[model samples]
Target: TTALVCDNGSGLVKAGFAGDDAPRAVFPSIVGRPRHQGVMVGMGQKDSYVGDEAQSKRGILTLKYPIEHGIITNWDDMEKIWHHTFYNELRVAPEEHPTLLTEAPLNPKANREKMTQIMFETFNVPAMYVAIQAVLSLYASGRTTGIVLDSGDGVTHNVPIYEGYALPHAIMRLDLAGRDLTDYLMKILTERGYSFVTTAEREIVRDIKEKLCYVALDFENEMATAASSSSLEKSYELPDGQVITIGNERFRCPETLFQPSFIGMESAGIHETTYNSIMKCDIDIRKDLYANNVLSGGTTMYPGIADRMQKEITALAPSTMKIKIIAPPERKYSVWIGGSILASLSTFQQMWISKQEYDEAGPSIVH
Candidate 1:
């Protein structure tokens, strides 16, 4: 049976077949309505766009984010996002594939039910399976049990998975994540006479952050060194023929992960969050959680992040417990990769919510 593995991220949606190691199509989880080119603004013709099409329009299109803060707040746009992925991008009919979707730790029941309803009634999929992204990240790292630290676009979460399930009560969440870093950089750059005044410009700033940002092992020392020399500075050219130089903003921005209060957020840092979540779980598995601390999500891919987090976590964790951070080469696609692995398994195929069952029991079948 064909399986469609989809990871619906706040920033981007990664979708492809189960056997694929990476997604076939990656696009912003955004829909757009372009400005009318015709004479009449109200009566003129316009086209609805998704993914690259919407993003390509940039300033001319009115962009709508379907998922906000890692939750599906707009089901109508969410449906269109999935439709665009399945039909436009993958070119596969939903009925032919047993689809697998990824969700965050605390997604509401109403949202889950709406999702199942959409899949069964709207797409008419043969079967469906919904997996927690954190659990899937663990599976992708080739571990059935591990502490998953997923720092996505909207928020960061610490989920401790035992076997194939997540210990829900032990989950830790922080609103300060990748987007916050992006915004922080934007704010700093703006203060330094750089104009990231537009969405497109802000996107360029995000790209610059990805290319230049890194977690500093020694923040004060690094800042002192940067203060003494301009070696930390990097140059970036914008699309509008503007060349700008970025200095300590690189390390200083990602530093917020370890010090969220720096950006005015009241959450404990990632290390504390991870440690607290692990401690809440049964002590017997704490050792396992420490040794198999798996890091996933685009935010975690920042350079020196693994080392920085490991060092901080080591300081807080018990001396007897071993601490290791598992960051796969494709750290950003860990959840999607795990979904791919799971969907291809013969045993997992039986776990899918079949269309027949959905038709009989309705959206409650997803439970």
Candidate 2:
């Protein structure tokens, strides 16, 4: 049987067939209910939509995302997303292939059990395996031991994976992420006399953030000269055709990653958390761990973000170690890409818990 891989991120759902270098589909983790004007289908008066269709129907539909802080809160919505992914995106019969799914670090047992139940009972897949995203992300970088800093949409995680295993006890998690930066950019834009009062308007703000945001090598120096320098000035027009000029807000927004307290979140920055996570490990592996740090997730896509991160982490590294951050190609889909690699292995076939196993042993087998 072929293999299917998917990473259930809070912001985006990345899914594809195994052996592929990247996801076949990348879309927001959202479900939308269109208004009466929308084309109705089999499910009552309103048909559900996902991915680009859902985003296109925004404001015209009531949109809901199932995952929050990397946790699935609505199984019904989650199921819809899976259905959309399989039927619409991948265009494969889920039952015909072995599936590998990814979950956040520290996912509750109850959640896993629920996911197991859904996969076995709902989709009836032949076999399945659930893995932690951090480990998969590390594997995507072609490494067995390293530090992975995942700055996703809803939360950021500092996870240490050694020899294909995640060190859960040393994991560091924070709520600051891509969505937080979007909100921050919106706030700054508002202060600069721009308004984003609608869903589309806010999404436009997000688009602006993605296109213009960057991590500063030196925040003070950048900010001091930002207004005086033409390089810092950028103009974006909203969907409503209103032009908005953005200035220093670009650096100030991404600055939250290096300083969480800048947005009033009480947590250490990525550098400190990474340092502390390494410190919690055995002394023998410190240098090896420092030599192969990996950065993944959507937020890492910003210009100069990884470079700034490497500079900071290098400065903070112990005198006994040299720091190297592995910003893998297509880092945003690292977890999905890693899962693709794992599911492609012939040895990996044995790891899949078959539907027969699940039927005979139940969810306890997954536990």
Candidate 3:
């Protein structure tokens, strides 16, 4: 049977069957309900919406993201999101297919147990595997051992994997990521007297960042020319039909990734975190980890991110060691693609914890 693979990120859920090149359904991992309650099943009442539909409801509904900071916080809404993914999005019955789900590194054991219980008792999936996002992303990059710098909407995690196993102690996480960049952009726009503060307006800012924002190879040099360089300035038309000029903020916003102090956070930046993570691992694997640094997630999609990261990390490593950053074209969906590949492997059959095994051993079997 073809397995169902789902990579549940804080911002979006990428779902499709194993062996597929990409996910068939990629939607926001958010749920929305009417802000003002009015009842009746048949009286033309709009109850709730999930994913893209939820965003469409905008002002009429209150949006709630079930997953936060790479962890599922609202189980009820999460179940609903999964339900929508399986039935409404993929149009596949859960029981008919084995499931492969991706989870963040160092995810609580209780969460895994709860996930297994829900898959078996609720969805009735025949078999399931909860793979770590870092591992799957490494595999997607076509390497069994590497360091995956995954920065998505909610958080940034630098995970080091050696021989397909994640080095638990080496895993590092930052609360700042794509969403933070979006917020930073909004703040900068507000400073320019362009108000974009509402939740809906925030989406507009996110769009602007996605379209125009990029990392600067040299921050000081870019800032010096931002005022005088016409090339650095771009015009963006607001939804209200007003045009605004964005200059240094384009690179300044993403610059926060390399310098967290800009956001009032004292933590080290991504490149430092990557280096620290690799250093935490065994000395024997450090060279291999540095050579195979993998970049995955939406935030890493910034045009010059890989180049900037390579330059920064190279500055920190030894002169004898080599550094390579693998920013694959499909990195945004690399976690899901890796899961898709793993689930379709013939030898992976025995790796799944089947329904019968779960029945005999309960959720503890996942460990």
Candidate 4:
């Protein structure tokens, strides 16, 4: 079956045939409202792209502001992206493939209906099913009871699994995500005496974090040192062969998942959010599922992320409970992999509530 399993959130879009050899294509999930020309999605010559390509052109050929409040607000870009996704560009003949478009969770009814109509009327796939990545991971694990955690660019979504179904009431999200984490790194770099980010500069900071960022077992001391270290000094060499003095202190950024205060909006950190979802779960499920946790999405790629999450989340959980944090072997790719696997399975179609469900259930399709 030609399926399009969607991997979308407040941040990005990850869609394609379930078992695509490589990523169908990874885009920025944002579009730019250009100044003179029409609109630009990602990094194309104009506003004809979305997601990664648009980001690649930032401050070069174009400027960027990614998407509608998590990519659900605007219809034009969404429509165009969908069209570009399913059909060829510039009025090309349509490739008749069953589509699986991914969307956000607990979506508004109107938005959900719009999505169904688009798939049915616009693309006209043989069949389509809107499924969340969280549900698919549990399905992929072949497990009946557990918690599926998907962490990505904008936030982390946790949905408890029971008897092989996702517990919607126990689902929750923490807004601190990869984008903010990268932004934090950017800030620390700037304060360390650098302005403007070159691909190399950005890459180094990100690479440093990826390779070195770890959960401090004694977080209090490490965090205090990192938070206070911002005032210290450092030195660096740029790709263009420019040597400059900088500070390690300034480069020491905090993980928003752990230090929610780093977000400055005074929202709950990832740990608290996880606990909140846990508290919402049936006590019986909570106990059995405590040690069975699964991690998915881009945020899970941070080198020491799971350790930090495990530490903080475990700290937040009850002392009497057992905690097991299992990072997907290829953590970042887990959900997308699950989506690919799900899309190809003929039986997987049964898991989705189709347009008929929308017509009969009336928008509860999203709820």
Candidate topping lDDT? 3
C-alpha lDDT of residue 347 in model 1:
88
Alpha-carbon deviation at 35 in model 3, angstroms: 3.5
CA lDDT scores, all candidates in order? 0.77, 0.77, 0.78, 0.60
1 or 3, greater by lDDT: 3
* Weakest lDDT window of 10 consecutive positions for candidate 3: 37-46
Tens-digit lDDT track of model 3 for 1-367: 7888887678878889989888879887767777766554554365757768766557667777687776667888888888878878799998888888888877777578788878878888887888667777766767777778888787788887777666778878887788778767777777777865566566667777887888878888877766686788878786568888876788888888888987898998887888877766677777787777778888788788877866767776766767766676867888887788887678989798866787787677677
Give the TM-score (vs. native) of candidate 1: 0.92
Better model by lDDT: candidate 2 vs candidate 4 = 2
Which residue pairs clash within candidate 2?
none
Between candidates 2 and 3, the lDDT winner = 3
Model 3 regions lying over 4 Å from their true place: 36-44
